[PDB]
Amino acid sequence: NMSLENVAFNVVNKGHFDGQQGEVPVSIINNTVYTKVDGVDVELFENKTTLPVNVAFELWAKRNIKPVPEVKILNNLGVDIAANTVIWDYKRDAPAHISTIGVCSMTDIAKKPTETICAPLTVFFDGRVDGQVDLFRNARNGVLITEGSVKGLQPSVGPKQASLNGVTLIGEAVKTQFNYYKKVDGVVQQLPETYFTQSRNLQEFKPRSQMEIDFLELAMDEFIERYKLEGYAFEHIVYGDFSHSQLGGLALLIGLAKRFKESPFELEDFIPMDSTVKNYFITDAQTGSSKCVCSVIDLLLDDFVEIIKSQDLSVVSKVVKVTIDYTEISFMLWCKDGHVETFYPKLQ
Amino acid sequence: NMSLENVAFNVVNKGHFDGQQGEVPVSIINNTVYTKVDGVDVELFENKTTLPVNVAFELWAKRNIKPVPEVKILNNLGVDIAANTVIWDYKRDAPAHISTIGVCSMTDIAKKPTETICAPLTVFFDGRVDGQVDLFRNARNGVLITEGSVKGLQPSVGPKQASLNGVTLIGEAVKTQFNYYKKVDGVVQQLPETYFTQSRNLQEFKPRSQMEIDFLELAMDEFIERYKLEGYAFEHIVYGDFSHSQLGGLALLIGLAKRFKESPFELEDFIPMDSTVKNYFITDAQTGSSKCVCSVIDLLLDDFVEIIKSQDLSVVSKVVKVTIDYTEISFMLWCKDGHVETFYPKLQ
Amino acid sequence: NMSLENVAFNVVNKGHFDGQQGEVPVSIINNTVYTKVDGVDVELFENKTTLPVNVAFELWAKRNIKPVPEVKILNNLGVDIAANTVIWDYKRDAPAHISTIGVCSMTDIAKKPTETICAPLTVFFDGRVDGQVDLFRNARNGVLITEGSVKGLQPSVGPKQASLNGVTLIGEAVKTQFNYYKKVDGVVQQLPETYFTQSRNLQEFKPRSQMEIDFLELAMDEFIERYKLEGYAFEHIVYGDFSHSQLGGLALLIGLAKRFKESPFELEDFIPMDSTVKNYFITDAQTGSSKCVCSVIDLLLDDFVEIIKSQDLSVVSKVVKVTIDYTEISFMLWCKDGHVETFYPKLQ
Amino acid sequence: NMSLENVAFNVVNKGHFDGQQGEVPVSIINNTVYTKVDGVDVELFENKTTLPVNVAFELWAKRNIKPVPEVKILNNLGVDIAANTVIWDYKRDAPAHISTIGVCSMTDIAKKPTETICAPLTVFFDGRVDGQVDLFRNARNGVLITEGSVKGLQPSVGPKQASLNGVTLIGEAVKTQFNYYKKVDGVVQQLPETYFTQSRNLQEFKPRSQMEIDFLELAMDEFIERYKLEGYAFEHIVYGDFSHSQLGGLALLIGLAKRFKESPFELEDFIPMDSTVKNYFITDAQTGSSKCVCSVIDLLLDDFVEIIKSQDLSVVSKVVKVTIDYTEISFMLWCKDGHVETFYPKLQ
Amino acid sequence: NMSLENVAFNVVNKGHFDGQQGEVPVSIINNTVYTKVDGVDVELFENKTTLPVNVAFELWAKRNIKPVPEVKILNNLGVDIAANTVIWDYKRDAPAHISTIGVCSMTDIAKKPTETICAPLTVFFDGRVDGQVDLFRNARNGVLITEGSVKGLQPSVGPKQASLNGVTLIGEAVKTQFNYYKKVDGVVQQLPETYFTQSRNLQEFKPRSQMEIDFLELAMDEFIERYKLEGYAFEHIVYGDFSHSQLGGLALLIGLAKRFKESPFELEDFIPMDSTVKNYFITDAQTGSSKCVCSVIDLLLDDFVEIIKSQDLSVVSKVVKVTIDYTEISFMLWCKDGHVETFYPKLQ
């Protein structure tokens, strides 16, 4: 049944593996898969993974092409493997998980999730597929997503957005907001209250609240007065300090978005991966201000304002724990004379 | 005469092989050609082909840098090899043809096209080069292009555009529209009536007719009324249906061009090559609508309108054959109650 | 002390080597450095150099992240090696110099610049680092940069701009204009009068003088009259001739910048490196005019006007020598009937 | 602590990892580890594995250099991973097991065998190391070897021979015969009665019994008469039939050993690995007789005689199951008129 | 039908492709084919060819495993391609011919030899396979081998020996001497009278005539007298001159064979390929005599004696043409005073 030439047949005719019969000639060289079309070789897939070229080619061809959770969400929930599907990490151009379950013979540790080898693993189940909700009930450790209610299980509302072929979006003609469920050692877990990152980027940044709309349109002094943000160091934390050689603050993506429309700068994504907290080496082209490690998070500005207004400001410095994307992000809060000095995310 | 160090000499001084004498030091590593400039290695060429690095480097250096036919045209005409030149496929970043004739010692099957080994092959001749028109007369199988008339041979007008260093353009200070001629087994062939693709792209799409101008500026309902297109399913075929999870229709490049200026979308060119019919995996970022295989063709809208108005609409479904770029493209025409349901290009 | 796993620790936590203790797991494959993050491999660095992957990874991690001279300046001054730092060539994505001094064990020829092996080499010293000015006094061959005066040494003012993490800029919150000093065989050299290139690019070209502002806004005939440039062939040399198949002139970057905003064109940087004179294979998309070797230089228009008005125009053709970026650039000046025919930079 | 440069220090000074402090400079290229010795690079390790070069270098450096069970024995017992050691497969020049336990950060699934991830795996414990017997008692699945008695556990006597640095030997100044113990899902298993292969090769074949001594010294007809082997087809099964184009029988290594001293032949070990039954493509140089699949096993001739004399010969053909090296080897027994026609091992 | 995983199934079960159904998991890396056996990867084939790894793996698996002509014979006859089989060159560990006919989809230029593309090529036909003799009759250019008579065709007797799995042998239980036939442009050719090389090697050299037996057993002076070889410079041509720094003569393999049993020497086969005349760089370990280019041929000593006695010795130097292995070998004959000075094969 399964064969390399058959996988390439599906790619050239269906753009991915669709379970069609047929074979096309394949040549493998330079960590790349080629197929001969009318006597000339045409590249189909360049292996950017640590797996053998033919294996990653098969896993990429069999990737999930439906709206799926972003890898950072699955990582924060501790998912180790997916049930009968492949979650493709488009940030790394590699499969999001090492092993597979009933997908590819070279990476399979099992054919079905109920096998013994899958017991200590947090298997990801998709309720939109038949029988996977029931498989979640019988799994020792697992994470389940659904579009609607699950009888006898308390749900946790996930993010509004999901990944569709590497494009993060809030679905309009399709459903991207799921119900999340988790089991540990046979015991269903109650997921905590959590904020969610917006998963936006600088070039295509769009405001998602009237507070964010006012932040981008209005000036710094005018915005801080309107939302009564005196004493919270928004000039440093959000807008960023560019007067010195060392860049100060600038930890919210919306603050970088406002700056980029005025003046450009360089963001070095030295760990190209999906994470709730991103680390960038930033170099400002206009002034020369730079910082080796700029921890950046894309929170809705209303959510960040709700957090910063919810802290005690009578201590020089302390640790603030905030559950974001189902993981605890430890912040360092600095205060002086009852007002916020600085407030930034840490490495890990 | 021929040497690797001499080829690199021409590249660093002439940008390509110009037949100049001289040698520069060359080091080959990581499927890439380097040259030492003032004690440091500088990359000259990264081999993206299935040929050895030094051979593809020589063929790329000796590529034709004059306006030449697009590879899709040469493929549709069945060209297997070029006479004393190299047609470089910039879509694949590889030579458009396997073997050569009197160009590179490693790929040469012959020095001149009149040799015996070139008889069963469709050799491409360029009338702008001296003696190549006469060589075409004496060749068994061949394809000839000229700027003017050829005495005693009936011509076929080719496309307006040609490729100049990988840039498709309609020449203004240079001639890009050629006369085409073909011989099979010593017999001159009469090339059929054919449409020609426009070879445009989304980002730089420009209208080339008043009908195309009206299509991009006016709305869907207003455009269909002006050109009396009721009953031909232009809303589905050309404008595209985005209300469902499966994208419907959207097979003309001009329809994608109008959509992209409003909302962005992803086009996955999973077979990166020059072809009359292109296949894309499309993912709409705004709605979430997607389709694994979206057959796309860039016809002048007047040409597509002429075709769709030239069919019989009394059958549920049938095959429509249209000669485009000198090749037969088979379409699937669906009709209901005397009007067009859908109409799309097939795989191959 | 030094180790591959420790270097990767600094990269994932500090974006570069910062001298921190710690180790992260590293796997090397496909000429690329990977690290395991939560069970999956994440790429840290793809070796684009001719050095072993681990060595170039260490040198890139230890690159200088302060405003440093552009490589073309250091090359024109004959620098062979840097003292206790790594100048990273972002044009080639490789270290700007072969060997190192007290940086990396695999590339070190010495630990300190005063060793015997460093005597015949032009060592680069940075006065902003303690003791490097005094080390320059005791070096046989060397180049020194400072922000202020050096007691007992006559300075040479360098360019306004410097490179900060591969971004060329004129510093505003940091100092990018240095004083330059050079010694040959123990004898301090007097650097000649020189122009400086502006190191701009087409997409982000910005005028830096009222003459340049008038050049971009005004028309060709209107600009030549305002600055009294009749008889100097600015239509050909600066604006470029596109009426023929062979592109004529067009050797100043500002002339290409004005053209690109009107019509696009292709620039093939077939020697990707930092140099005072750049060579491009240009293909005009609008007209089809092209030229294999287009020598391009980015001089301030006032500087180029000062040069062209400073020549004798009574000879058919002769060589004009101009010291630019501390190197002699030989120009070919063609004149007819007392006016300039053409004037262009040569290869090397 | 752990580093690539530290591992290479141990290799150049101790031949393997000995836990010594120090670092030597290392360059990685061509899937090979090099170190600079007096200014020149010297190869330390060529990666013959499917793991990254640096990882296999660390695992090979930390391989077990004491007498350890042969890989075929561990595979037949279902061992998946070793506890705090590396069993190196010298037949494949690769580690015998995928993952490790407390050995290498890149391959470790756990630090100690008692962790949860090691529960479903058959972990190999070495009783000669402190605490590994007690760890076996508390492990869910495991295989244990000891030199002496284990209190409260019934032993299974293993082979006389063990592997020391890829050299199979019966220890004289060291102990190579161990007691074997196995647990499955917390339940200790009783290992069955089993024969053991001799693990010899053709070039260095030595007889290990007077029957084997008589087999090599005496002739075919003389040997069969002495041990009363009439009717068991030893001429075909053991001595081999070379009169026809297809080689017949010849399934015992001792039969090939006798033949090789007389006439040479080619053995293509097309699956180079340690297994109880080996498959060779044999081509006889003297006669031209060949056979694509010759299943070969190296049993003590007395053991094979004991087996063949313990079967019923009243059936045309049937399957005979024999437990060898703790695994069931299925044989095909063919008989005619109450005597053995042929008898050979199967594929798997 | 055809697939990489199916080919690997045949290799692990049949040692080569036998047309069996089944698939085994395959991983491709390091220009090598691996398969997973009991959880570990086992190497199946290391690509030593210039073809992609998977293609050479398929061609090697489908190689001809019957007695086939040696590659040097097929090359001298101008064979370009084989009909529905693969002649494997074991000297180069690569396929003997570039393209194939009805064998591998990636290398096939045609499915059957009667197609048009196979007309200008010298296709090799094997009369032992049904219909291949009749296909030879209808082929334009071809070479045919048979074991018996071919009706209506005059035969040419080939060598006594043939290659069986890279082992050259004179068949005893199988037929290795064939009848040779050749057609050029539809015209059957009469193959000339030719000698044949013995295709022996030094280590396993065996005399094949009483003259060769006397040559190895007797001394130099005694052998020349017995066969009346005075005046033919056999001391220099055959025995070799080792008294000087430049080795003199020594062009017959039998002369090197006699020397190697006495004293060892180094033979550098710097073009490792099958050819009638071999070129070796020889370094004598006993004396220090060496020669960069020693052209060596392995003729039966009786054949060389017949040749050298059939020449005119009245010219200082001239060219002697001898047809060996169906190709003209040009010799240089030097004579002085009516006796042979020297006589050696040339380069090509």
PDB file of C-alpha atoms in Angstrom, chain D residues 102-169:
ATOM      1  CA  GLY D 102      21.073   8.837  31.687  1.00  0.00           C
ATOM      2  CA  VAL D 103      23.802   8.733  29.032  1.00  0.00           C
ATOM      3  CA  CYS D 104      23.520  11.409  26.325  1.00  0.00           C
ATOM      4  CA  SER D 105      21.360  14.527  26.563  1.00  0.00           C
ATOM      5  CA  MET D 106      20.320  14.279  22.901  1.00  0.00           C
ATOM      6  CA  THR D 107      19.200  10.630  23.101  1.00  0.00           C
ATOM      7  CA  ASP D 108      18.094  10.433  26.750  1.00  0.00           C
ATOM      8  CA  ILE D 109      14.425   9.765  27.390  1.00  0.00           C
ATOM      9  CA  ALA D 110      15.211   9.664  31.131  1.00  0.00           C
ATOM     10  CA  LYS D 111      18.084   9.941  33.591  1.00  0.00           C
ATOM     11  CA  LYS D 112      17.271   6.855  35.686  1.00  0.00           C
ATOM     12  CA  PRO D 113      15.425   3.680  34.636  1.00  0.00           C
ATOM     13  CA  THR D 114      12.765   4.166  37.339  1.00  0.00           C
ATOM     14  CA  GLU D 115      11.216   7.129  35.509  1.00  0.00           C
ATOM     15  CA  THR D 116       7.738   6.766  34.034  1.00  0.00           C
ATOM     16  CA  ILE D 117       8.793   6.891  30.368  1.00  0.00           C
ATOM     17  CA  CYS D 118      10.921   3.752  30.867  1.00  0.00           C
ATOM     18  CA  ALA D 119       8.015   1.645  32.179  1.00  0.00           C
ATOM     19  CA  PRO D 120       6.699   0.149  28.883  1.00  0.00           C
ATOM     20  CA  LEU D 121      10.268  -0.518  27.693  1.00  0.00           C
ATOM     21  CA  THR D 122      12.396  -3.623  28.212  1.00  0.00           C
ATOM     22  CA  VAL D 123      15.379  -2.033  29.959  1.00  0.00           C
ATOM     23  CA  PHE D 124      18.660  -3.949  30.088  1.00  0.00           C
ATOM     24  CA  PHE D 125      20.298  -4.095  33.522  1.00  0.00           C
ATOM     25  CA  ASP D 126      23.861  -5.214  34.278  1.00  0.00           C
ATOM     26  CA  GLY D 127      24.171  -6.967  37.634  1.00  0.00           C
ATOM     27  CA  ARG D 128      27.921  -6.296  37.671  1.00  0.00           C
ATOM     28  CA  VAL D 129      27.097  -2.613  38.349  1.00  0.00           C
ATOM     29  CA  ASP D 130      25.907  -1.602  41.814  1.00  0.00           C
ATOM     30  CA  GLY D 131      22.149  -1.296  42.271  1.00  0.00           C
ATOM     31  CA  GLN D 132      21.168  -2.535  38.810  1.00  0.00           C
ATOM     32  CA  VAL D 133      19.857  -5.868  40.120  1.00  0.00           C
ATOM     33  CA  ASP D 134      17.652  -4.033  42.627  1.00  0.00           C
ATOM     34  CA  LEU D 135      16.505  -1.647  39.886  1.00  0.00           C
ATOM     35  CA  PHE D 136      15.479  -4.717  37.875  1.00  0.00           C
ATOM     36  CA  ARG D 137      13.266  -5.921  40.735  1.00  0.00           C
ATOM     37  CA  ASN D 138      11.385  -2.598  40.686  1.00  0.00           C
ATOM     38  CA  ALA D 139      11.209  -2.268  36.886  1.00  0.00           C
ATOM     39  CA  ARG D 140       8.068  -3.236  34.998  1.00  0.00           C
ATOM     40  CA  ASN D 141       9.838  -4.723  31.949  1.00  0.00           C
ATOM     41  CA  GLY D 142      13.515  -5.628  32.011  1.00  0.00           C
ATOM     42  CA  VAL D 143      16.287  -8.091  31.229  1.00  0.00           C
ATOM     43  CA  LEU D 144      19.042  -8.797  33.762  1.00  0.00           C
ATOM     44  CA  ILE D 145      22.447 -10.487  33.510  1.00  0.00           C
ATOM     45  CA  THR D 146      24.607 -11.535  36.469  1.00  0.00           C
ATOM     46  CA  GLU D 147      27.761 -13.555  37.086  1.00  0.00           C
ATOM     47  CA  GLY D 148      26.424 -15.349  40.164  1.00  0.00           C
ATOM     48  CA  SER D 149      23.197 -16.179  41.962  1.00  0.00           C
ATOM     49  CA  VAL D 150      20.411 -13.657  42.507  1.00  0.00           C
ATOM     50  CA  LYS D 151      18.522 -14.176  45.756  1.00  0.00           C
ATOM     51  CA  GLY D 152      14.922 -15.215  45.148  1.00  0.00           C
ATOM     52  CA  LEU D 153      15.162 -15.531  41.350  1.00  0.00           C
ATOM     53  CA  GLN D 154      15.420 -18.621  39.160  1.00  0.00           C
ATOM     54  CA  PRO D 155      18.217 -18.160  36.593  1.00  0.00           C
ATOM     55  CA  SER D 156      18.647 -18.998  32.925  1.00  0.00           C
ATOM     56  CA  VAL D 157      22.144 -19.912  31.752  1.00  0.00           C
ATOM     57  CA  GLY D 158      23.220 -17.826  28.781  1.00  0.00           C
ATOM     58  CA  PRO D 159      25.795 -18.447  26.063  1.00  0.00           C
ATOM     59  CA  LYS D 160      29.407 -19.253  26.828  1.00  0.00           C
ATOM     60  CA  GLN D 161      30.551 -16.284  24.727  1.00  0.00           C
ATOM     61  CA  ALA D 162      30.124 -12.519  24.993  1.00  0.00           C
ATOM     62  CA  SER D 163      31.233  -9.480  22.996  1.00  0.00           C
ATOM     63  CA  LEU D 164      34.288  -7.469  24.089  1.00  0.00           C
ATOM     64  CA  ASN D 165      34.851  -4.427  21.837  1.00  0.00           C
ATOM     65  CA  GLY D 166      33.094  -6.201  18.978  1.00  0.00           C
ATOM     66  CA  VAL D 167      35.140  -9.385  19.467  1.00  0.00           C
ATOM     67  CA  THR D 168      33.040 -12.419  20.369  1.00  0.00           C
ATOM     68  CA  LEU D 169      34.897 -14.662  22.803  1.00  0.00           C
TER      69      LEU D 169
END
